[PDB]
Amino acid sequence: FYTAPSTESKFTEVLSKAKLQYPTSTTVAFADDLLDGYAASYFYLTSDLYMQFQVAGSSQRSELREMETSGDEAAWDCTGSTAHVASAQIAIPVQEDGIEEVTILQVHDSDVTPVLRISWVSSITIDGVTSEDVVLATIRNGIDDSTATKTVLQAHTTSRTEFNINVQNSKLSITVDGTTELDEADISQFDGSTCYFKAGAYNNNPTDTSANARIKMYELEWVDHHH
Numbered sequence: 001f002y003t004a005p006s007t008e009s010k011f012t013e014v015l016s017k018a019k020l021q022y023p024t025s026t027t028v029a030f031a032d033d034l035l036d037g038y039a040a041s042y043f044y045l046t047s048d049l050y051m052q053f054q055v056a057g058s059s060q061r062s063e064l065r066e067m068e069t070s071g072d073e074a075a076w077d078c079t080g081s082t083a084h085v086a087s088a089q090i091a092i093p094v095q096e097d098g099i100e101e102v103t104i105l106q107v108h109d110s111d112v113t114p115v116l117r118i119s120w121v122s123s124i125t126i127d128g129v130t131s132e133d134v135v136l137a138t139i140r141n142g143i144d145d146s147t148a149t150k151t152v153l154q155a156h157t158t159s160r161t162e163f164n165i166n167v168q169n170s171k172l173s174i175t176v177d178g179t180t181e182l183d184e185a186d187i188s189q190f191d192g193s194t195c196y197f198k199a200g201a202y203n204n205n206p207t208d209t210s211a212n213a214r215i216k217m218y219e220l221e222w223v224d225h226h227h
Ligand SMILES: O=C(O)[C@H]1O[C@@H](O[C@H]2[C@H](O)[C@H](O)[C@H](O[C@H]3[C@H](O)[C@H](O)[C@H](O)O[C@@H]3C(=O)O)O[C@@H]2C(=O)O)[C@@H](O)[C@@H](O)[C@@H]1O
Pocket: 059, 114, 125, 126, 127, 138, 140, 146, 147, 148, 149, 150, 204
């Protein structure tokens, strides 16, 4: 009894350029499946026209993974000189009790390293300073370095919020509601890697594994200009 996001043509672009993974990295719907009305409890269109992702469990996800219009998986040079852009209007609801971090957008390499995660967090301590109920950027310092550089981007609100990621020329910038909150962070540690965008709900370190993380996107688009 779920309405498909494909019924809203504002999503045709991203669904044409995506595959849906749930609840692990396994694909449940490729782009043609998504365009042909795919819908489930973890991926459906709400009555006010958001594409809503929901998932329970530690490190479980309901997430779109960037594809090319041609059908190829996106695998763009992470530090290449063309603009690689993702843009989303995201409403982050107040999360269920026991949900402690939800990653909503990513840049991920073609192996096992997330270049960037943008996540909501209940509480985070960065260089000894604790922030509550914030949206964060986490950039991994290297493929062989588990540490990351973390930057608070926004106090959490339930209101629809525009997030833009621009990855270009070995730098990465994030704007939030039009304001630059991470300005040309260096991601040269990903030279020689290939990359792709992800978007949805990726549930990190919950303290209640039955609770659902839930994220809604009113608009979502992404572009990889091949050079
Ligand atoms: O506040 C810190 O910077 C904190 O980060 C700790 O390492 C983190 C790392 O920064 C990052 O958040 C990582 O995120 C995971 C993700 O949660 C998921 O589980 C998957 O593994 O991909 C991501 C990844 O591998 O980058 O999780 C790390 C963690 O320990 O939870 C430490 O560096 C710590 O010293 C520091 O205080």
